[PDB]
């Protein structure tokens, strides 16, 4: 139901890095995508992938249920967008 | 795709009230519901409805696209859960 599109230009990902307070480094992969929210065009969205998750190939995806969780105030929140092919 | 269930016990809603800093009062309706996230059972979630939105009747619902928006850091966030009957 939520249609997410990774265009050919968006196979191109980036990696952000640093070290934590507690002496330990990190790297997160980041990729852009288009999410169709029923507006005139799809919106540009940024995804930050989980540790050691490969970037997504071009194609149509949908949002996997594991993207969601119950937040701090009892309401449903997005943890991070986890996609599965359509 | 996200299945939300309002049980007969959850027709029972509540209203929270107060006045704002800038001299103006408010009231938000709040209702509970069950969201199926593929785990062993559905999770209990709290919904806070929009201004002047009536509470939901019992039944099966799904999440409407207008629940989502692009947040402050460029990622997709839930604004508040807006439901439509299944």
CATH code at A7? 2.40.50.140
Biggest CA-to-CA distance, chain A: 46
**Exposure on the CB side of residue B71, measured as CA atoms within 13 A:** 15
Choose, out of A37, A39, A65, A76, the residue to mutate when testing the contact with B (most B CBs < 10 Å): A76
Q: CA A63, CA B59: separation in Å to the nearest integer? A: 24
**Which positions in chain A have a beta carbon within 8 angstroms of at least one beta carbon in chain B?**
1-2, 35-38, 43-48, 62-63, 65-66, 68-70, 73-78, 80-81
Q: How many residues does chain B have?
A: 86
Q: CA A65, CA B30: separation in Å to the nearest integer? A: 24
Q: With CB atoms and an 8 Å threshold, state whether B45 touches A80.
A: no
CA distances from A65 to B20, B41, B54 (A): 36, 14, 27
Residues of B33-48 as b/e, b for ≥16 C-beta within 10 angstroms? bbbebeeeebeebbbe
First to last CA, chain B: 10
Number of compact structural domains in chain B:
1
Stated in angstroms to one decimal place, the resolution of this structure is: 1.7
Token pair of A12 as six digits: 């191109």
Within chain B, strands assigned E span 3-6, 14-19, 25-36, 43-48, 59-63, 68-70, 76-78, 83-85
Q: With CB atoms and an 8 Å threshold, state whether B68 touches A2.
A: yes
Nearest beta carbon to residue B74 from set A1, A46, A80: A46
Backbone angles phi, psi at A67, to 5 degrees: -65, -20
Nearest beta carbon to residue A70 from set B45, B62, B73: B45
Token pair of A45 as six digits: 């969205």
A–B interface: beta-carbon pairs under 8 A: 67
Structural domain of B48: 1-86
Token pair of B11 as six digits: 């027709």
Neighboring chain A residues of B66 at a CB cutoff of 8 Å: 37-38
Query: Residue B64, SS3?
Result: coil
Contact A48, B75 (CB under 8 A): yes
Q: Obtained via which technique? A: X-ray
Going by C-alpha positions, the residue among B48, B4, B45, B43 that lies closest to residue A1 is B4
Q: CA A86, CA B8: separation in Å to the nearest integer? A: 34
Residue A47: other Cβ atoms inside 10 A: 25
Going by C-alpha positions, the residue among B21, B46, B18, B52 that lies closest to residue B33 is B46
Mark residue A38 as left, alpha or beta (left: phi above 0; alpha: psi -120 to 50; beta: remaining): left
């Amino acid at each position: 139901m939520i249609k997410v599109e990774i265009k050919p230009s968006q196979a191109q990902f980036t990696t952000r890095s640093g070290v934590s307070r507690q002496g330990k480094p990190y790297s997160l992969n980041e990729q852009l995508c288009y999410v169709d929210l029923g507006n005139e065009y799809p919106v540009l969205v940024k995804i930050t992938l989980d540790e050691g998750q490969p970037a997504y190939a071009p194609g149509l995806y949908t949002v996997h249920l594991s993207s969601f969780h119950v937040g701090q105030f009892g309401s449903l929140m997005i943890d991070r967008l986890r996609l599965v092919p359509a």
